[PDB]
């Protein structure tokens, strides 16, 4: 007997008007499927959004607790469980997701087996348990039938490229996704639509089309009630304003933090965002994470030290960084920091070269601005943005 069903029964006893309110929020014609759901074990809604929407409306603070219990009791052979897998991945509920995956890889239903195996490849790729090559091979071998997994096999690569600073292949890979071929599962289709919007927003950011970046994040916001997507929309909109509008960037990062502060991971992401913003604008920076040894946090320490002429403290941090392995995007940032410390043109040239390898047309603005300040030809600098 699921916790959600116990809670709803209790709340219904205290307020009869909930039946009709829940029916509306669940997008139902009448309360019949709700009566059925409350009274009969294993009855599932037609669309997974019905249960999600009721939980968000009625128990917003108990969502994880209730959906964990609910998802982990589903028959993994059902459409509801397939929906649940996507729900768990979309919200980064990895404990729910990995249990669902494991059940579904070895079950008798062919749709559930394929979902399970594609999501497992995504989980492994994003944990660096396998390489891109190994992932692409394993996906090829599955001979994917569903339009859903056809979409997701492309989405999982997009996430990989975004997080490894490899922006070149993203624009063409996303065009291949056709969500209109998904007909069975509306929850999956609509959630994937949100995913595509947020990824598109990131792709446009990296191309330096910033109004377009903002439009896609706004479309993500309107399309969704999922915190993970809202977080990344506000992050991306704020990011797009990093060079042009301090106040509006800060307002987006704070808005994001305000809806997500209770989650450790999102809380950290917005601190890092605000940390980066305050360095770019050379303000006093209360957002530095001094405990962390990641490239991302160390770079921000060094950047702050440089802004405030603590050069030998900057140099110490950069020495720690010289001993760590960088991808191209990270090394581009590293050379910018060395350029700022040493006031050395050659470091800005190297920085430009590595942003170009990474296909980052956004952050390249950092060494370009320094060259402008040193009186380099402004027109050539603008041309280096294209």
């Amino acid at each position: 007997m699921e916790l959600i069903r116990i809670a709803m029964k209790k709340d219904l006893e205290n307020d009869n008007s909930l039946m009709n309110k829940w029916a509306t929020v669940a997008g139902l014609k009448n309360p019949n499927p709700l009566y059925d759901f409350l009274n009969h074990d294993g009855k599932t809604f037609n669309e997974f959004s019905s249960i999600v929407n009721i939980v968000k409306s009625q128990y917003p603070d108990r969502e994880y607790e209730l959906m964990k219990d609910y998802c982990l009791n589903l028959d993994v052979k059902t459409k509801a469980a397939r929906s649940a897998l996507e729900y768990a991945d979309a919200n980064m509920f990895f404990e729910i997701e990995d249990v669902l995956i494991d059940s579904m890889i070895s079950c008798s239903n062919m749709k559930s087996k394929e979902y399970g195996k594609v999501y497992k490849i995504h989980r492994e790729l994003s944990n660096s348990v396998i390489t891109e090559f190994e992932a692409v091979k394993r996906l090829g071998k599955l001979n994917i039938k569903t339009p859903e997994m056809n979409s997701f096999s492309r989405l999982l690569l997009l996430y990989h490229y975004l997080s490894t600073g490899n922006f070149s292949p993203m624009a063409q890979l996303i065009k291949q996704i056709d969500l209109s071929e998904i007909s069975e599962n509306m929850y999956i289709r609509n959630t994937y639509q949100t995913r595509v919007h947020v990824l598109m927003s990131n792709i446009k950011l990296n191309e330096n089309s910033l109004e377009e970046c903002r439009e896609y994040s706004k479309k993500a916001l309107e399309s969704t009630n999922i915190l993970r997507f809202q977080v990344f929309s506000y992050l991306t909109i704020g990011n797009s304003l990093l060079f042009s509008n301090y106040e509006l960037a800060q307002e987006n990062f704070l808005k994001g933090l305000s809806i997500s502060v209770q989650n450790e991971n999102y809380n950290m992401i917005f601190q890092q965002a605000l940390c980066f913003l305050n360095n770019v604008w050379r303000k006093e920076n209360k957002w530095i994470n001094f405990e962390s040894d990641s490239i991302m946090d160390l770079q921000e320490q060094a950047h702050c030290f440089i802004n405030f002429n603590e050069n030998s403290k900057a140099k110490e941090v950069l020495d720690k960084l010289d001993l760590l392995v960088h991808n191209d995007n990270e090394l581009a940032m590293h050379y910018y920091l060395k350029g700022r410390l040493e006031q050395n043109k050659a470091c800005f040239y190297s920085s430009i070269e590595y942003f170009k390898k990474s296909n980052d047309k956004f952050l390249i603005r950092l060494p370009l601005l320094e060259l402008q300040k040193m009186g380099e030809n402004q027109k050539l600098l603008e041309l280096l943005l294209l």
Partner: peptide, 6 residues
């Protein structure tokens, strides 16, 4: 670096 995510 600047956090990115989707």
């Amino acid at each position: 670096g600047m956090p990115r995510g989707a």
